[PDB]
Amino acid sequence: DDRPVFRTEKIKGVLLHPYRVLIFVRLIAFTLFVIWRISHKNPDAMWLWVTSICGEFWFGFSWLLDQLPKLNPINRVPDLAVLRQRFDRPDGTSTLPGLDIFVTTADPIKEPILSTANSVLSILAADYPVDRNTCYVSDDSGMLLTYEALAESSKFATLWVPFCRKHGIEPRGPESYFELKSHPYMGRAQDEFVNDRRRVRKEYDEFKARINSLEHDIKQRNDGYNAPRPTWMADGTQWEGTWVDASENHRRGDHAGIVLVLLNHPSHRRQTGPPASADNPLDLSGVDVRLPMLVYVSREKRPGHDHQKKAGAMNALTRASALLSNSPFILNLDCDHYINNSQALRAGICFMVGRDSDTVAFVQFPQRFEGVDPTDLYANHNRIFFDGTLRALDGMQGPIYVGTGCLFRRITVFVDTIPRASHPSPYAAAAEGIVADEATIVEAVNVTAAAFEKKTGWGKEIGWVYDTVTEDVVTGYRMHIKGWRSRYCSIYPHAFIGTAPINLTERLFQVLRWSTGSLEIFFSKNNPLFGSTYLHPLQRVAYINITTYPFTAIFLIFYTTVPALSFVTGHFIVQRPTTMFYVYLGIVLSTLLVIAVLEVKWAGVTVFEWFRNGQFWMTASCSAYLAAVCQVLTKVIFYADLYVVRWTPLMITPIIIIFVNIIGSAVAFAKVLDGEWTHWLKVAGGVFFNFWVLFHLYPFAKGILGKHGKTPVVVLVWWAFTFVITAVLYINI
Report H helices in 407-503. 418-422, 438-447, 471-480
Helix (H) or strand (E) segment spanning residue 76: strand 74-78
394 belongs to the catalytic site: no
User: How far apart are the C-alpha atoms of 688 and 326, rounded to whole Å?
Assistant: 63
Cis? peptide before 537, omega within 30° of 0: no
| DSSP sequence for 343-410 | THHHHHHHHHHSTT-SSEEEEE--EEE----TT-SS--S-HHHIIIIIHHHTTTT-----SSSEEEE-
Strand order in the sheet with 338-339: 338-339, 496-498, 367-369
What does each C-alpha distance from 143 to 220, 287, 307, 332, 505 come to in angstroms?
A: 16, 35, 17, 21, 27
Residue (of 315, 320, 279, 327) closest to 297 by Cα position: 320
Q: How many residues does the chain have?
A: 733
Sheet strands (E) in 458-514? 485-488, 496-498
User: How far apart are the C-alpha atoms of 171 and 338, rounded to whole Å?
Assistant: 9
User: How far apart are the C-alpha atoms of 194 and 179, rounded to whole Å?
Assistant: 16
What does each C-alpha distance from 327 to 99, 280, 330 come to in angstroms?
A: 6, 36, 7
User: How far apart are the C-alpha atoms of 12 and 28, rounded to whole Å?
Assistant: 24
CA torsion sign for 116, 118, 121, 122 is negative
Residue (of 412, 338, 418, 326) closest to 370 by Cα position: 338
Could you tell me which residues come within 8 angstroms of residue 448 by beta carbon, excluding any fewer than 6 positions away? 257, 259, 297, 299, 300, 316, 319, 320, 323
Please indicate if the annotation marks 334 as binding a ligand.
yes
Per DSSP bridges, beta strands 329-334 and 406-409 are antiparallel
User: How far apart are the C-alpha atoms of 17 and 160, rounded to whole Å?
Assistant: 53
Buried b (16+ CB within 10 A) or exposed e, 497-528: bbbbeeebbebbeebbebbbbbbbbbeeebeb
Please indicate if the annotation marks 140 as binding a ligand.
yes
358 belongs to the catalytic site: no
Per DSSP bridges, beta strands 99-105 and 329-334 are parallel
DSSP state of 713: T
User: How far apart are the C-alpha atoms of 291 and 456, rounded to whole Å?
Assistant: 38
| DSSP sequence for 131-144 | TTEEEEEEETT--H
Could you tell me which residues come within 8 angstroms of residue 581 by beta carbon, excluding any fewer than 6 positions away? 36, 574
| DSSP sequence for 629-675 | HHHHHHHHH--GGGG-----GGGHHHHHHHHHHHHHHHHHHHHHHTT
Could you tell me which residues come within 8 angstroms of residue 476 by beta carbon, excluding any fewer than 6 positions away? 362, 400, 401, 486
Could you tell me which residues come within 8 angstroms of residue 627 by beta carbon, excluding any fewer than 6 positions away? 512, 515, 650, 653
3-state helix, strand, coil in the chain (%, to 5): 55, 10, 35
User: How far apart are the C-alpha atoms of 91 and 39, rounded to whole Å?
Assistant: 78
Strand partners, 88: 94
User: How far apart are the C-alpha atoms of 320 and 312, rounded to whole Å?
Assistant: 12
Catalytic position from the list 88, 254, 306, 472:
472
User: Is 39 exposed, middle or buried (CB count within 10 Å of its CB: 0-12, 13-18, 19+)?
Assistant: exposed
What does each C-alpha distance from 253 to 299, 408, 609, 665 come to in angstroms?
A: 10, 29, 45, 56
Please indicate if the annotation marks 310 as binding a ligand.
yes
Amino acid occupying residue 299: R
Catalytic position from the list 100, 131, 140, 336:
140
Catalytic residues: 140, 472
| Residue ranges of the binding site for UDP-alpha-D-glucose | 110-111, 140, 309
The annotated binding site is made up of 110-111, 140, 309-310, 334
Annotated binding site for Mn(2+): 310, 334
